[model samples]
Target: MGAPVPYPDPLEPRGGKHICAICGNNAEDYKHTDMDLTYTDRDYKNCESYHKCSDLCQYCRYQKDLAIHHQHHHGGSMGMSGSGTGY
Candidate 1:
């Protein structure tokens, strides 16, 4: 079996050395709003700025795009991955 894979860190800054919310690198500060990100069915109200930015970056807001960004930067499956099927 493969070695245990570590879970990805939250896509938000923890204050040690603030980083960009979209790229996760380079020193920068971002302000986040406390609210439910309906697109992902996840609550980011308490999370830091980086995570919030990942959901609504300057580029796009499509669920797939957001999921790709989230999965790339934060690891783990997105909250709404494989959702949106026939009801």
Candidate 2:
């Protein structure tokens, strides 16, 4: 066995190769990401999507994706994305 690899280039886009925000280890190339896999929020803080990061995060790709409509539906915040958690 070997020590794990590192995150991809910041300039790189989604897909190809990347790291799992959750485990902090290199993720499968272009693997489909989910809430549990990509996010970790004690209070809905780090719930990023395919192209969206948390607003609380320094890198906020959460402009439109964090919409009140999308947030609730996507598990962002209550009445923020869609409706609320457990939808």
Candidate 3:
């Protein structure tokens, strides 16, 4: 059988980070709204940035309503991979 696979760590911390780009919550204190991510559904490598406090980040609300390249620019499948929403 294959050895146990470790889970991927988010670019930011879990309990919180620098400030979520989506909810305006401080990343340092922001709750990890999406931690159900696994490696069995979609692809994690191809998953796009779901957080955006920096420049040109395409996973936050700034571009969420833009929907021109949400799940097309990165993922090759049709489901969530990193944050259990969509990648």
Candidate 4:
């Protein structure tokens, strides 16, 4: 019923670097060392700036994208991968 963001191997940080593009929250800073990234470099851009302290980030809003992209993009076949893992 709407245009959905159907992206994400782990998904991406949507807009600018200082905030959560999807949720528009501040991208709080942390040491957030390169090692902290699960996918490394890919999942940590949505909130790549402005935070000199830690409280928020892409995962903050990114956490929700998991539901939307899954629900909106391929909610159907996604279940298929779970039920049938064999090729």
Candidates' C-alpha lDDT:
0.40, 0.38, 0.39, 0.42
Query: Model 2 Cα displacement at 78 (Å)?
Result: 49
lDDT of 4 by residue, 7-52 (tens): 4444454554455443343334433443344443454344354433
Comparing 1 with 2 on lDDT, the higher-scoring candidate is 1
Query: Tens-digit lDDT track for model 3 on 1-87?
Result: 764345433542442233354443333333554343333443233245555534333344333322332333654465464456545
Q: How accurate is candidate 1 locally (lDDT)?
A: 0.40
Per-residue lDDT for 12-68 in model 2, tens only? 554221334554323332223333444443323344445544322323343442232
Better of 2 and 3 by TM-score: 3
Considering every candidate listed, which one attains the maximal lDDT? 4
Better of 1 and 3 by lDDT: 1
Model 1, C-alpha of 87: deviation from truth (Å): 34
Task: Give the distance in Å from residue 64's predicted Cα in candidate 1 to where it truly belongs.
Answer: 2.9
Q: Sorted by lDDT, highest first, which candidate order results?
A: 4, 1, 3, 2
What lDDT, from 0 to 1, does candidate 4 have? Answer: 0.42
Q: List TM-score per model, in order.
A: 0.16, 0.14, 0.17, 0.16
Regions of model 3 farther than 4 Å from truth: 1-14, 17-37, 43-87
Which residue ranges in model 4 land beyond 4 Å of their true spot? 1-14, 20-26, 31-33, 39-87
